[PDB]
Amino acid sequence: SLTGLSDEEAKEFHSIFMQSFLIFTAVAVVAHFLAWAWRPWIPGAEGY
Amino acid sequence: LTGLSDEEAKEFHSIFMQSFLIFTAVAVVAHFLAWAWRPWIPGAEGY
Amino acid sequence: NVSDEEAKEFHAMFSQAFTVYIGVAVVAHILAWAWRPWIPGDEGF
Amino acid sequence: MWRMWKILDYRRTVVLAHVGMAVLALLIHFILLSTENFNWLQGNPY
Amino acid sequence: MWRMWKILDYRRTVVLAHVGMAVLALLIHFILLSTENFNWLQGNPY
Amino acid sequence: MWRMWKILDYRRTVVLAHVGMAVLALLIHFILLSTENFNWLQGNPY
Amino acid sequence: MEGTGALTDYMNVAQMTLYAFWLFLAGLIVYLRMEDKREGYPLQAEANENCNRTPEKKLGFPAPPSPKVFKLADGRSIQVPRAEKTDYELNTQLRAEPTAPWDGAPLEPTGNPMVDGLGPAAWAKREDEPEVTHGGKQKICPLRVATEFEVGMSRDVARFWPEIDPDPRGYQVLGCDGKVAGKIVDIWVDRGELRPMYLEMDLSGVGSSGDRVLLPINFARVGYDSKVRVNAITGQQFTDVPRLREADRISPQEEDFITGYFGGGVLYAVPGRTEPFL
Amino acid sequence: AMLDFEKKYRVRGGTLLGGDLFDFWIGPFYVGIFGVLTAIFAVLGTVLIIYGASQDTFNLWQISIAPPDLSYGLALAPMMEGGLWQIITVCALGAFITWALRQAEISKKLGMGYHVPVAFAVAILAYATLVVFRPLLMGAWGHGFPYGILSHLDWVSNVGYQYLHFHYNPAHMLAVTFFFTTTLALALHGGLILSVTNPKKGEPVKTAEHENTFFRDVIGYSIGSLGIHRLGLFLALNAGFWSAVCIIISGPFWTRGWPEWWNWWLNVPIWSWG
Amino acid sequence: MWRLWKLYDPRRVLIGIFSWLAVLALVIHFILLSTDRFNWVGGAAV
Amino acid sequence: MWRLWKLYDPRRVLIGIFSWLAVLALVIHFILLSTDRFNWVGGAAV
Amino acid sequence: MWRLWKLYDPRRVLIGIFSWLAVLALVIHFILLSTDRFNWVGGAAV
Amino acid sequence: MWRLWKLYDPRRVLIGIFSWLAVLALVIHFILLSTDRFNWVGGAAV
Amino acid sequence: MWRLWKLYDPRRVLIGIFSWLAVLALVIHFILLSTDRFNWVGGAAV
Amino acid sequence: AEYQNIFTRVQVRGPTDPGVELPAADWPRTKGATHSWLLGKIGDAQVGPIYLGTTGVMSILFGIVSIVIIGMNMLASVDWSPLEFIRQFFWVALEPPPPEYGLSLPPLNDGGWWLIAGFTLTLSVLLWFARTYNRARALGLGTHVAWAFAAAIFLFLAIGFIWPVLMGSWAKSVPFGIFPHLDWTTAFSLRYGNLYYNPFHMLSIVFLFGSALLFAMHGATILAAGRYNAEREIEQITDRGTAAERSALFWRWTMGFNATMESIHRWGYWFAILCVITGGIGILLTGTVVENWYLWGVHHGIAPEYPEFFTPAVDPAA
Ligand code: BCL
Ligand code: BCL
Ligand SMILES: CC[C@H]1c2cc3[nH]c4c(c3C)C(=O)[C@H](C(=O)OC)c4c3nc(cc4[nH]c(cc(n2)[C@@H]1C)c(C(C)=O)c4C)[C@@H](C)[C@@H]3CCC(=O)OC/C=C(/C)CCC[C@H](C)CCC[C@H](C)CCCC(C)C
Ligand SMILES: CC[C@H]1c2cc3[nH]c4c(c3C)C(=O)[C@H](C(=O)OC)c4c3nc(cc4[nH]c(cc(n2)[C@@H]1C)c(C(C)=O)c4C)[C@@H](C)[C@@H]3CCC(=O)OC/C=C(\C)CCC[C@H](C)CCC[C@H](C)CCCC(C)C
Ligand SMILES: COC(C)(C)C/C=C/C(C)=C/C=C/C(C)=C/C=C/C(C)=C/C=C\C=C(C)\C=C\C=C(C)\C=C\C=C(C)\C=C\CC(C)(C)OC
Ligand SMILES: CCCCCCCCCCCCO[C@@H]1O[C@H](CO)[C@@H](O[C@H]2O[C@H](CO)[C@@H](O)[C@H](O)[C@H]2O)[C@H](O)[C@H]1O
Ligand SMILES: [Fe+3]
Ligand SMILES: [Mg+2]
Secondary structure, eight states, rough: OSSSSSSHHHHHHHHHHHHHHHHHHHHHHHHHHHHHHOOOOOTTBBBB | SSSSSHHHHHHHHHHHHHHHHHHHHHHHHHHHHHHHHHOOBBBBTTO | OOOHHHHHHHOOOOOOOOHHHHHHHHHHHHHHHHHHHHSSSSTTT | GGGGTSSSSSHHHHHHHHHHHHHHHHHHHHHHSSSSSSSSSTTTTO | GGGGTTTOOHHHHHHHHHHHHHHHHHHHHHHHHSSTTTTTTTTOOO | GGGGTTOHHHHHHHHHHHHHHHHHHHHHHHHHHHHHSSSSTTTOOO | OOOOOBSSSSOOOOOOOOHHHHHHHHHHHHHHHHTTSSOOOOOOOOOGSTTTOOOOEESSSSOOOOEEEEEEEOOOOOESSSSHHHHHHHHOOSSSESSSSTTTTOOEEEEHHHHHHHGGGGGOOSSSSBBBBBTBBBEEETTOOTTTTEEOOOOOHHHOOOOOOOOOOOOEEEEETTTTEEEEEEEEETTTTTTEEEEEEOOOSSOTTTTTTEEEEEEEEEEEESEEEEESSSSGHHHHHHHHBBTBBHHHHHHHHHHHHHHHHHSSTTTTTTSOOO | BBBBTGGGBBBBBOOSSSSSSSSSSSSEEHHHHHHHHHHHHEEEHHHHHHHHHHOOOTTTTTTTTOOOOGTTTTTEEEEEEEHHHHHHHHHHHHHHHHHHHHHHHHHTTOOOHHHHHHHEEEEEEEHHHHIHHHHHHOGGGSSSBBSSSHHHHHHHHHHHHTTOOGGGOOOHHHHHHHHHHHHHHHHHHHHHHHHHHOOOSOOOOOOOOEEEEEEEEHBBBBHHHHHHHHHHHHHHHHHHHHHHHHHSSSTOOOOOOHHHHHHHTTTTTTOOOO | OOHHHHOHHHHHHHHHHHHHHHHHHHHHHHHHHHHHOOOOOTTTOO | GGGGGSOOHHHHHHHHHHHHHHHHHHHHHHHHHHHHOOOOTTTTTO | OHHHHHSSHHHHHHHHHHHHHHHHHHHHHHHHHHHHSSTTTTOOOO | OOHHHHHHHHHHHHHHHHHHHHHHHHHHHHHHHHSSOOOOTTOOOO | TTTHHHOOOOOHHHHHHHHHHHHHHHHHHHHHHHHTTOOOTTTTTO | OOOOSSSSOOEEEEOOOOOOOOOOOOOOOOOOOOHHHHHHHSOOOOHHHHOHHHHHHHHHHHHHHHHHHHHHHHHHHHOOOOHHHTTTTTTTOOOOGGGGTTTTOOGGTTTHHHHHHHHHHHHHHHHEEEEEEEEEEEOOOHHHHHHHHHHHHHHHHIIIIIIIHTTTGGGGOEEEEEEHHHHHHHHHHHHHGGGGGGGHHHHHHHHOOOHHHHHHHHHHHHHHHHTTTTTTTTHHHOOOHHHHHHHHHHHHHHSSSSOTTTTTHHHHHHHHHHHHHHHHHHHHTTTTBBSOOHHHHHTTTTTOOOOOOOOOOOOTTO
């Protein structure tokens, strides 16, 4: 059927979900920038 | 609790401690005879 | 037992999610191609 | 094309789609990890 | 520390302690028997 | 994020967090033992 | 040969250990075949099997053991094979005629084999006292009295994916010929087995809507479209399903009446089922 | 002679072929058309086996009807060079298939489902894998196993060592797991039913409550009266099926040593550690 | 897309995401440790 | 000797006799195919 | 030809077609990966 | 200390103690038979 | 933090903690037995 | 188009069954019981509760100690790497003592850990035997399950303890590893000349194959007669319903003889435990009173003879 959950409460979960996902990806992107600064993972034509 | 009065519990305990003492005492004698045969605690040099 | 309004709303969630996922994957394949093209020539890569 | 969801159950189609696309994406990523020209961690010449 | 027996069941703590110490005593005695410096039956030099 | 506990059952989440962190901490410590430069019990030069 | 194990110039210990196990295996095989002969024995040799044209009893080999006493929970020491079941079988006048007089000829039913308990429609002689749990509750009871049970093992599965956790209450029943027999009104559950056993239905499609009939669950194919398809019997044949003595209980005998009637449909529900493919 | 309840069940119908012509019982056996066929096939194959035995040795264990040479390919061979084996194979296959079709006639007559003939079809599948399907894929009837009590044990030994360690066959480890687990389940199932119906002397026959309680007391789960027979059938049929899989992939789909097959596991990028 | 949570139970989606993220991060971290170049505790040179 | 059919049903004895004849004819024909002298299609010499 | 759907359930047909298409597409792709001419990731030369 | 027997069944405790003693005695006697010093039936010298 | 003992049965928490400590202590002790430097029964020099 | 009794279509959930009451000295059961939809399709849905008493706890403690010893030694053999542990999971093992130690107690790292793991594993399975025995007796059931388990214990003890003891070396026993104990199984057959020719290995396989045959026959028959409540087998033993008669008639008409609802479980029980008992006897015979099983088979005229196909090899060192 449907999840028993108010139309406004569903909007509330989504807002926190998209803020938590955005913060999770924001930390992940910085972590990736720090790792590429350590050792880049896309090799060139001749390799590393 | 189990179906024992304070008296039947005490009667079991007295026989239990008597049996336990006798079993231990026999075992102690067996251990004195065995030690007389060959001791089982080695020195720094061994046996 | 799904109405026309429920079906339309589902396909909007499907449309939005399908659009982002394809749009990102196409960008992934352009960057992947710009790195090392995966279709060899007569002599190889 | 919304009528697709009067045919299938959309709730399970999306769950099935995620599991299938996860398996396929790991399949392709692992396959590239086994090749020589597309193993980005190995970094062999191209 | 008798309030411990208003939390734990003293009947089943006593059984557990006895069987637990039985496992540990056999384990330790057997570990010592499997060492050259403390197998008191082999009596290797110390 | 106190609303998180109106979604996730807090009693089960706490237990699974401790169980999960037990596996992860043991795993990370074991990984460091396997490496040469971070096995503190072996004491290799860094 | 020589070495450890030699008993003679040829016999050795492993070989004689093997023959020792042969003797045990025989004694176990004989013992097992005797345990096999506590139901349906001694064999009833009919007159038309024997050259003297007299009925007889064959023990077989090994001969059956002595009768075995099962003490029961309610305080009743029953003996096996049971005397009342043997007496019912030997005295029941079958409503069937052998297709030939020689031994081994199949019976061809005279009247209606489904209501007469012939072949796949047959029933055993069982107790008429409804079964009880260990605690004394009614073992097989409908959900209206067994109110502690609710349909559906998983509430979330029953609510969001009801196709795989269905509730057949209110479902239409169809026979093997696609005709509507009625509506499922209740479900009967075994308090010990924790399973549905019967789907009580009314006869609103082929008889009185107030009539109640039990459909065994293993004969019911609970579909995904709110229809229960019974391949055993024609929809019109739901009217002759044996009725319960009491609307809220079923004896083990009535279980054999009801499952027996549906099982008989496998051969007799429609013409041609008895007939071969070719 | 019949069981004292058997008479009412002996009715007409349920056949797939033969109709009334073979629809009768000889003693306890239902005959049917597939019983006559399974009799002709079985007697033919057994008598042909004894003829093959008379040409080498009558010692029961040393009797062996061997398949033809691999050089024969799929051709039918001379009788004393594996043609006798090939006829016995088509006789045994027919004997097995008509046995299952006959059990299907018996199933319908007693109103039972077709679980028994189908469960036997898995066993027939494994034999068909051994003597037809795998020899076909490899390209010679000579890949099948010889018909001899001790000569087919050497075939199993040598075919197993054709892959240098047959224990590492992934499908064989699965089939062995299903065989071990099903006899474990059979020990528990047989034992639990005997334990209830035969309690300690002086005790009433127990209930299905005690059966569920016993295994919930022992392992914390009970599969139930119905579950034990589904699982029991499941474990034994998977035992047969994965037997067929393990042997059909040994040679047609793997020609190296089975331990080498696990090279993919040793090379998984997640846990290479080098 | 707020309606996504009127269809899918938030707890099961979050448990599914968390299980995927835990397995995926463990698998990525393990794959990196398996490579010579990105094993950060193996201490190799490029 | 006609009374043998007051004992055995003609349908069953004929099914058993014909089954016996079919087995017998095939066994004898096949045994001859096994022999070098009577394998007529093989066509050896004497 | 629209009468085809009067006799066949559209969900069952589309599920069956997609399972056929997915498996067939996988098998053709994997067959091309094992050849020496159409192994595109392997980068074989003609 | 006699209050033990209200807590536990004497039959169960006696069976448990006796089963422990039998296994302990069996283990110790075997351990002595395996050494070269306390194997009495072997007659090895000190 | 005291409200934890209303959420859980304290008997269960203690049993779980102790069961964990017993396994952890045994794992640690076995680890030290594996290394040369901290094998105390082996008695190897530094 | 008929229902095949393979999955339970309609399920009904009630309150958790707490189990039959135990005597007033047993430990309380656990309080944890939940219902599973997935398990309810195959059969009973309830998971838990579980009893744990003196024997259960001590069996678990002895077993955990055994698993920790095996696991830590396995992990130590790969230099403590969890990644290398997964890579080598089937290959790692706790290795038995080398042959030079005989039956003495070897050092921990030279089979000593193996001997401790084997001792605690033996104790846990023996206590588990007492647990299975007592749980049956506490419910007033027969001890059939425990003795069937005891039969499996005897093969386990014959393989790991009795036969290595009869041979005079712990080296002959089996290591605690997945592929290594398969290596032990093959090497055992190589060493004593093709265990196929061991007659008690033949009988062991007869009852093992016959056990799968029996469970397939019986399980299929109970599902086939599920329309008549065959799976309620206890009711059919005490009150022979039509399902018990159709099951017996089905096999009487098929192979000429049948069983009863009760005797089928005696056939299956004995086939299960004879498989493991002839297994133990066969293991005890080899090495002790039979050196080479093929040579034993030649002596007793069971080895097939093979005509010439190749030029026979000759031992150069003859
Ligand atoms: C906040 C909102 C939610 C979310 C809400 C939604 C909604 C709403 C939808 C999606 C849908 C999708 N989401 Mg989402 N999604 C989220 C975030 C993500 C993220 C991410 C990294 O953040 C990813 C990668 C995805 C990915 C996806 C795709 C699975 C799908 C869009 C493509 C599509 O059209 O599938 C369609 C493709 C198929 C149907 C093919 C089916 C796959 C089959 C089974 C694979 C067969 C081949 C395969 C190789 C078989 C393997 C066998 C081998 C031999 C072993 N989502 C977040 C968590 N998402 C859409 C969807 O599910 O479409 C049905 C959709 O409607
Ligand atoms: C050294 C050799 C290798 C090895 C090489 C092989 C080879 C080769 C094979 C197996 C096969 C099997 N191996 Mg292995 N296997 C080894 C060691 C083992 C060990 C062990 C103790 O280590 C075990 C437990 C097993 C277990 C198994 C099973 C999984 C499987 C056999 C069961 C089966 O096929 O049923 C199937 C049952 C049948 C096929 C029976 C057919 C029944 C027919 C339909 C009816 C016959 C009726 C009859 C004629 C009636 C008689 C007449 C009446 C009685 C009157 N193997 C060693 C390591 N193994 C076999 C397999 O899986 O093939 C399918 C196989 O071919
Ligand atoms: C797939 C799961 C297991 C299984 C299942 C199974 N077997 C079954 C069934 C089922 C469900 C039956 O219903 C059917 C039956 O009714 O059993 C009583 C059967 C059966 N399984 C049997 C045997 C059997 N099953 C085996 C295995 C298994 N059966 C699996 C482990 C084995 C093994 C492992 O070796 C054997 C020997 C029979 C007792 C019976 C089938 C009887 C049958 O088919 O009879 C036909 C007529 C005959 C007399 C057969 C012989 C006819 C031939 C022409 C001659 C012999 C040829 C053969 C190639 C000789 C080979 C000998 C050498 C190998 C030594
Ligand atoms: C007739 C012979 C066949 C047979 C029979 C048989 N086996 C049996 C039985 C029988 C009759 C039982 O009654 C017994 C049983 O329990 O059955 C369910 C058993 C059994 N057979 C087993 C295994 C088994 N049987 C096998 C074989 C066979 N069993 C034969 C083929 C094999 C094979 C093929 O090798 C195996 C591996 C067990 C599952 C079980 C007996 C279990 C046992 O003895 O366990 C001892 C204790 C331990 C190992 C302790 C460790 C267990 C856990 C890790 C402890 C958990 C601790 C804590 C509670 C939780 C911690 C985690 C927290 C996060 C919560
Ligand atoms: C690090 O790991 C942690 C702690 C995280 C947990 C993980 C544990 C893991 C993963 C463990 C993995 C275990 C595995 C895979 C084990 C595999 C085991 C197998 C396949 C075993 C198979 C056969 C083994 C047998 C049959 C062993 C037999 C040994 C016996 C019977 C020993 C008997 C010994 C006795 C009775 C001892 C006697 C000692 C006496 C006292 C007599 O000596 C004087
Ligand atoms: C109702 C069932 C109907 C029967 C079904 C039969 C299916 C199984 C047979 C499939 C076809 C087998 O095909 C078989 O191939 C082999 C090739 O080695 C042929 O053999 C042929 O070539 C070989 C050499 O290759 C020659 O030595 C031989 O003289 C010649 O006959 C057989 O003549 C043919 O029978
Ligand atoms: Fe059963
Ligand atoms: Mg090894």
